[PDB]
Amino acid sequence: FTGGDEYQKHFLPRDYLATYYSFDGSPSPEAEMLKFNLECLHKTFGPGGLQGDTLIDIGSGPTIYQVLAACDSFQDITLSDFTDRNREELEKWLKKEPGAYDWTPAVKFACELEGNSGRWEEKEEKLRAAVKRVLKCDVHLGNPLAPAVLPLADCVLTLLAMECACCSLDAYRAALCNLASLLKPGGHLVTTVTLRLPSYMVGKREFSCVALEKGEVEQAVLDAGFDIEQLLHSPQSYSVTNAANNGVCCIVARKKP
Ligand SMILES: Nc1ncnc2c1ncn2[C@@H]1O[C@H](CSCC[C@H](N)C(=O)O)[C@@H](O)[C@H]1O
């Protein structure tokens, strides 16, 4: 199973973005996966949804799409990733440096969900302003952000990373408890997990995944001290050449006080 050393040495954010977030304008399963997540996130963080002071995104990778809805409802956002190269990409985007990845199609889609795709620059800058820090994280640690110690948060967000970080169902179950430690009682975990996925491509390089069934994920969430508040499933899959998953599950879970 590809572990931390393999990520640190060999995970290339530019290859990751080209595989899963190409914005080539074509009809594609990768685009549909992004759309599904953007839809779930608008439901979760838009009008009538979750709101609070602090949100921590765990395993952000080099991507910012996952917090476009969130920045309307959480004023202090932390992004975090295990892989140094990924944190560098995030900082390029936040700083508006020349090498920053162009997320415009996703920003526009996020705004479209809110009823006006024309306000995309406003959303882009609102997110950028809301992101206060970019930190190392490791979900296997009791405190995933160690040696940083943040105040307990209103929300922990994590998309498509836990199943890459964890080699087994047991590792995944423990990692959920580690995320739960970052939350206030009554706080929420928001997570999207790909199902029955054993591996995924990042450009020409293969990385491992733990193959999880949604029943297992659901039990793991309950066992980590949460209840399930919302659950949104789709059969949507990536190209099987990239990642042969059996659909996808987005879960909003509340840490029981
Ligand atoms: N132990 C660990 N703790 C936290 N993140 C880890 C990790 N091991 C691997 N990762 C991260 O898991 C991510 C998987 S790719 C998912 C990226 C992004 N959240 C998206 O929505 O596309 C990578 O960014 C990788 O660095």
Which residue range(s) make up the domain with 135? 1-257
Q: Determine the distance separating the centroid of ligand 1 and the alpha carbon of 118, expressed in angstroms.
A: 31
Preceding omega of 13 cis (within 30 degrees of 0): no
> Considering its fold, how many domains does the chain have in total?
1
Residue 21 assigned ligand-binding role: yes
Bridging pattern class, strands 183-194 and 199-202: unpaired
What is the C-alpha separation between 58 and 47, in angstroms, rounded? 24
Convert 64-76 to b/e letters by CB count within 10 Å (16 or more is b): bbbbbbbbbbbeb
Index of the ligand 1 atom closest to the CA of residue 20: 22
Sheet containing 52-57: give its strands across: 131-136, 74-81, 52-57, 153-159, 183-194, 248-255, 226-234
Residue nearest to atom 7 of ligand 1 (CA): 165
140 close to ligand 1 (CB < 6 Angstrom): yes
Report the CATH number that the domain containing residue 13 is assigned in CATH: 3.40.50.150
Resolution (A): 1.7
> Ligand 1: does its nearest atom lie under 6 Å from the Cβ of 80?
no
Strands 183-194 and 248-255: antiparallel
Which residue type, as a one-letter code, is found at position 257? P
Task: Please name the residue whose Cα sits nearest to atom 24 of ligand 1.
Answer: 61
Pair type for strands 199-202 and 205-208: antiparallel
